[PDB]
Each structure stands twice: as structure tokens, then as C-alpha cells.
């Protein structure tokens, strides 16, 4: 991943990755979390 | 380098190996740092001639005419 100044890219860091064997499971987890997050702000806005 | 220098003409360090002068810049670019080193050998006496002396003679005599 990099940084763009002076009309040129300038790389910041770089990571060794690996494909997960269970994409759908991390996906459920992330999005359950996200659902929770939105709902919270919803309730807060109501009270406000 | 130009954008850095023209204002000043970031931090700099200089060192002279036996004959050559070595100039080091500590700065940053794109947020990220940028390091470069200048490696300037002792300049030539034609270069010395043309860049300093003959022009500097020229200075001296022209200001004499001024006076």
C-alpha cells in the first residue's frame, strides 16, 4: 500500500497474506458486527 | 530536491572523505522520509577558473570601473 504525492506513488508497507479457507465465516462475523453498529446509532438518533 | 532547496537557497549533514566532500540530506517526502547523499569531488581548476576566479577578477575590475 502506498502514498501518492508529487504525481508519483510512494509505498508505505507491504504484507504477506494468505487466503482464508472459510471466507463466509469471517464475512458473517464482520457483518453481524456492522449490523449491531448501525442499529446503535439508530437508537441514539431516536432519543436525541 | 528542487522544492526543498530553492527555499533554503529537513536537515543536512556534510563530511569530507580524503578529497571528496559528501553531503547528506535528512528530509521527508509524501509524509515518508527521503534520504539522499551528495558526492562532490574537489572541483576542477578550469571549473575553479570559470566559476570563481575569472568571474571574481571580473567582479573586482568591474567594481573598480564603478568606483
DSSP string covering A1-48: -EEEETTEEEE---------S-HHHHHHHHHHHHHHHHHHHHHHHHH-
A→B contacts (Cβ < 8 Å), by residue, are 3-6, 8, 10, 12
Cα separations in angstroms, A26 against A16, A19, A40, B38, B44? 19, 12, 22, 51, 67
Which of these, B50, B42, B8, lies nearest to B25 by C-alpha position? B8
Whole-angstrom distance, CA of residue A11 vs CA of residue B32:
9
Hey, which residues does B35 pair with through a beta bridge?
B26
Q: Which residues touch B15 (CB under 8 Å, ≥6 apart)?
A: B21, B22, B24
**Resolution of the model in angstroms:** 8.4
Experimental method: cryo-EM
- Which one of A1, A5, A7 would you mutate to disrupt binding with B, by most B Cβ within 10 Å of its Cβ? A5
Whole-angstrom distance, CA of residue A6 vs CA of residue B27:
15
Written as nine digits, the cell of A9 is 506513488
**Residue of chain B nearest A9, judged by CA positions:** B30
Whole-angstrom distance, CA of residue B16 vs CA of residue B39:
9
Written as nine digits, the cell of A21 is 479457507
Amino acid at each position: 500500500f502506498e502514498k501518492n504525492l508529487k504525481d508519483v506513488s510512494f509505498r508505505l508497507g507491504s504484507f504477506n497474506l494468505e487466503k482464508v479457507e472459510n471466507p463466509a465465516e469471517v464475512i458473517r462475523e464482520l457483518i453481524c458486527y456492522c449490523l449491531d453498529t448501525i442499529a446503535e446509532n439508530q437508537a441514539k438518533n431516536e432519543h436525541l | 530536491l528542487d522544492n526543498l532547496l530553492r527555499p533554503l537557497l529537513a536537515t543536512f549533514s556534510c563530511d569530507c572523505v580524503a578529497d571528496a566532500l559528501i553531503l547528506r540530506v535528512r528530509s521527508e517526502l509524501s509524509g515518508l522520509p527521503f534520504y539522499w547523499n551528495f558526492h562532490c569531488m574537489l572541483a576542477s581548476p578550469s571549473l575553479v577558473s570559470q566559476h570563481l576566479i575569472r568571474p571574481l577578477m571580473g567582479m573586482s575590475l568591474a567594481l573598480q570601473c564603478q568606483v
